[PDB]
Amino acid sequence: TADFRLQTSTLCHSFLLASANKQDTDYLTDLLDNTNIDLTCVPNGQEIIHSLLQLVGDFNQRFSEPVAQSLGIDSDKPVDKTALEIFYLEILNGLFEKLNWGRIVAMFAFLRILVLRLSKHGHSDAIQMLIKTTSQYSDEKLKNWINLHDGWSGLIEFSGR
C-alpha cells in the first residue's frame, strides 16, 4: 500500500489520462510521464477510477472562464503556475465548505477541465503542479473525511458499482 498523498496523485494521474482517451483528441498521454505511476499501489484503484469517471461525467452533464480567461489556460503562452495554484486552492477552499463525496467529484471535475484545456498546448508543468496541489490539499483537508468513508474505496459504493 502507499501513503494517502501518493495514492491521491496516482489516482489523479490515471483519471486524467483515462478521461483524455475519452476525448476526440488525447494530448495528455504524450505530454505526461506514465512510467512512475502504478494504480496497483492504490487499494481498489481501478474501480475507484471507473467510479470517479462515471460520477464526473454525470456531474459534467448536470452543471454547465472568469479566471481561466485571466490565466490564459487556453493560450499557447507559458502560464503563471504560481497564480493558477492560489486560484485553484481558493476555488477548492470554497468548494469544501461542505465535505461530501459529491464535492470531491466536483474537485476532480475541475482538475479535468483545467488539465484538458491546458493539454491542447504543452503546459505539462502546470498540470503536474495542479496534480501535486490536489494531492497536498487532499492530504491536509480531505484525508480525515475520506478515511472515515472507507477511504478512496468509498467512491465505489457511492457510485452504485
Ligand SMILES: CN(C)CC[C@H](CSc1ccccc1)Nc1ccc(S(=O)(=O)NC(=O)c2ccc(N3CCN(Cc4ccccc4-c4ccc(Cl)cc4)CC3)cc2)cc1[N+](=O)[O-]
Ligand atoms: C441518479 N442520477 C439520475 C442522478 C445523479 C445525481 C446528479 S449529478 C451529480 C450531482 C452532484 C455531484 C456529481 C454529480 N448524482 C448525485 C447527486 C447528488 C450527489 S451529492 O449529494 O453527494 N452531491 C451533490 O448533490 C452536490 C455536490 C456538489 C455540487 N456542486 C454544485 C456547484 N459546483 C460549482 C462550483 C462551486 C465552487 C467552486 C467550483 C465549482 C465548480 C466545480 C466543478 C466544476 Cl466542473 C465547475 C465549477 C460545486 C459542486 C452540487 C451537488 C452526488 C451525485 N453523484 O455522485 O453523482
